Amino acid sequence: DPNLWTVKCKIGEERATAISLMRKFIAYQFTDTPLQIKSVVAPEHVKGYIYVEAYKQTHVKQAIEGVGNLRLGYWNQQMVPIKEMTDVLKVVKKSWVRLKRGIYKDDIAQVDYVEPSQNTISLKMIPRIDYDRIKAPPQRLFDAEKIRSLGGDVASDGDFLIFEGNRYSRKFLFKSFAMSAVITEGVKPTLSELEKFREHNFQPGDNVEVCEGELINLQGKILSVDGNKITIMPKHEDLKDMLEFPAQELRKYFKMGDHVKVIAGRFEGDTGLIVRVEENFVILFSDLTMHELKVLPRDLQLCSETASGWGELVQLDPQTVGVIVRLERETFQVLNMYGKVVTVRHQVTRKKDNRFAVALDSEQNNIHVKDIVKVIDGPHSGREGEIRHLFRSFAFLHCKKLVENGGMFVCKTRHLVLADNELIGQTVRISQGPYKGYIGVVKDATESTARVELHSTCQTISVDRQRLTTV
Amino acid sequence: LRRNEQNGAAAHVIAEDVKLLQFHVATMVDNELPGLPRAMQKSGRPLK
Amino acid sequence: DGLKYSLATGNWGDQKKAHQARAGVSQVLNRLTFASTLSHLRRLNSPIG
Amino acid sequence: MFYHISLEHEILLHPRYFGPNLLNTVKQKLFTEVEGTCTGKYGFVIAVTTIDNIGAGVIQPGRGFVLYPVKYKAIVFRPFKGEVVDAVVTQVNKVGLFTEIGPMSCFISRHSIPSEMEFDPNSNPPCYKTMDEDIVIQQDDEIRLKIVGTRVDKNDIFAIGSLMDDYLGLV
DNA sequence: GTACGTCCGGCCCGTAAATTCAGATCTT
RNA sequence: UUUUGGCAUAGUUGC
DNA sequence: AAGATCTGAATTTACGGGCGCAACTATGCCGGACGTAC
């Protein structure tokens, strides 16, 4: 039987090469220079090269002669070994789609109306445009007022709108796109995309028990992980031999009073300790707060890292500074000196903190930052906190026991108790001293003396300002 | 190469990908390999 | 661009073939004295080879 | 628990402190340093009973500082797990009880308190009172609590006490 | 309808190992 | 209110 | 006696090092595709 030989081809032009070779064969099949090759293969997903079926390499070389697209495989060709010729032909494989071409590439598209014509479908999209303001971009909501104000290619029909290359929108882009230009299989969007429009998680080191089978109630530490049927290798108590368990047979059991973290859900990101393990309701206390958190056994993992649980000085405005008390995705929760917690945007300014600032307490004792001070008057009388930032007449106090605002509050300082030169770059004239008569330019100046670059001599000299007279 | 694994593509293409990966790693450690090209940045300059 | 490159750099041969290109053939003309310029213009080079 | 053990510490002496009273200065500086501190591996250190041997003062050859090794017999309290320990309740709160065991501050959590005890928010002195009134938990009372576990943070040990087991609490 | 402009795809030397020839301990 | 920066090729030159 | 094979001992290619520092000037990625504007 003949053999397949690899020939390097121009990328993106393999099917055209196959068509051209077929035409070449048919054109010369009756002439005195026949193509002795048998077939040409240009697979669908194999990009860069094609395959030629022949008994000889010389036949391949004499058959591809005159084809420029294969010139990079002309001098040398590589045979496909025998055992592997079955793999060249081996092939594998109100909804949501994702566009293939254009600026909306790989963007989620809610199939609004499917057209039975089998040419295009109507898709709901979030516009990635600059509203004809930068061009002469991330996903953001469609603003019809902005595109009406800026003008340009814009046609308005209330909530409906046509604009910028016949892009159609309503209230959100609503545009027809080719079905072959989108993917209908393997999108699987997330909850965030739902708003816009089982699972196994075992890790090494975690403790798991056995809920069923002849090996029941054996608790061991996870070694390896795989997808569905894990065939786990758990290090049980008082057993040197390693046994096998799938994911379904196991459960994330944890003994009382061990480090616990939450992988997902409402309680994700919080660390702490479990107190009593019931059949499935596992109750824990957080490291931050002493609130009861009840979790499923599967939503628990054994990690020994300390909780994260930040506190920067930011300028709410030039008349009032602010201290960040919580970091959020698009905002900062900031605590000012008034004691009012506010929610502000990311784009406040960073003020230069004065770590050497001195403040006076209620008893005329000097206090500084990182000083544990008791509050003896004001709204927060009775509490004790560590000074973190200072003002003319205010001081911010941190307290780990106080769960509000990460422990940050503020009190007035008096209700606490401790527990260039103008002459620079100016043409001057030395009117007195040994250097009299010389014109120069002032380099550096002080209260007493000033350096002068001497115009004439290759030297700079400092002299008293009383000896200088400006031109 | 990982893509060819997790889809389960052909094996000869995996072997050629392994060949080129081996070449790239060796050139990264040592850009002097007899009978093989020197690594270039698409500007005809040998890479350190 | 090839003539301009070769005379600008003194590498002789193709730009992509700078590995095998004889170098230093074209030099910046020396301007310190008239004698230096004249001696540079009448200079011969022996390659190692 | 309390142990009188020999420990190794290192002291950088500044050249100003040379002359007579050098070794006395090293003694005083050891006392200023080790005392009033807790460590994770060896717990609290209360006081140095004595100094066993002052090592040879090696001069660091870029600095002028002199490194002195010191062996010293000191008393250390190491809170261990699974021990009944005597304790004095120092603070009583809604969320839990704070007790002192020597230098150590033990926190008996609300769940760790037995369910036969309930906080008394109707009393001006807050307290955990039993349903049948056989023991009252207030500040400054002699109790015997079981250490559920020692927990170290910033090289300072706080443990959890429990009274679930018999023969615990006020006696 | 055409093209252009600009954003995405491609001499030594010593070693040192590989190549070549008579004991040797067999088989006859 | 106190900055900072290309690099790695070739040539030439000085002792 | 013979005949091996057969195992220690003369001859060919291949890396791979190749003076100190210091100073100066001198040069240094693009081609198809998709869209805008005219």
From Swiss-Prot, chain A:
Effect noted on mutating R350E: Reduces the affinity for Pol II elongation complex
Organs and tissues of expression: Ubiquitously expressed.
Subcellular location: Nucleus
Ranges where the record places region Interaction with RNA polymerase II: 131-202
Region listing for Interaction with SUPT4H1, in residue ranges: 1-93
Residue intervals of the KOW domain: 94-124, 202-233, 254-285, 367-400, 422-455
Residues where N6-acetyllysine is found: K436
PTM text: Methylated by PRMT1/HRMT1L2 and PRMT5/SKB1. Methylation negatively regulates interaction with P-TEFb and RNA polymerase II. Phosphorylated by CDK7 and CDK9. Phosphorylation by P-TEFb (CDK9) at Thr residues of the C-terminal repeats alleviates transcriptional pausing and promotes transcription elongation. Dephosphorylated by the INTAC complex when transcripts are unfavorably configured for transcriptional elongation, leading to premature transcription termination: dephosphorylation is mediated by the PPP2CA component of the INTAC complex. Dephosphorylated by the PNUTS-PP1 complex in termination zones downstream of poly(A) sites, thereby promoting deceleration of RNA polymerase II transcription.
Effect of W75A: Reduces the affinity for Pol II elongation complex
Known outcome of mutating K351A: Reduces the affinity for Pol II elongation complex
Superkingdom of the source species: Eukaryota
Outcome following mutation: K351E: Reduces the affinity for Pol II elongation complex
Binding, RNA: K352
Positions bound to DNA: R392
Quaternary state and interactors: Interacts with SUPT4H1 to form DSIF. DSIF interacts with the positive transcription elongation factor b complex (P-TEFb complex), which is composed of CDK9 and cyclin-T (CCNT1 or CCNT2). DSIF interacts with RNA polymerase II (Pol II); forms DNA and RNA clamps that stabilize Pol II elongation complex while maintaining the nontemplate DNA strand in the transcription bubble and nascent RNA in the exit channel. This interaction is reduced by phosphorylation of the C-terminal domain (CTD) of POLR2A by P-TEFb.
Role noted for this protein: Component of the DRB sensitivity-inducing factor complex (DSIF complex), which regulates mRNA processing and transcription elongation by RNA polymerase II. DSIF positively regulates mRNA capping by stimulating the mRNA guanylyltransferase activity of RNGTT/CAP1A. DSIF also acts cooperatively with the negative elongation factor complex (NELF complex) to enhance transcriptional pausing at sites proximal to the promoter. Transcriptional pausing may facilitate the assembly of an elongation competent RNA polymerase II complex.
Protein family membership: Belongs to the SPT5 family.
Official protein name in the record: Transcription elongation factor SPT5
UniProt organism field: Homo sapiens
Covered residues, full protein: 176 to 753 of 1087
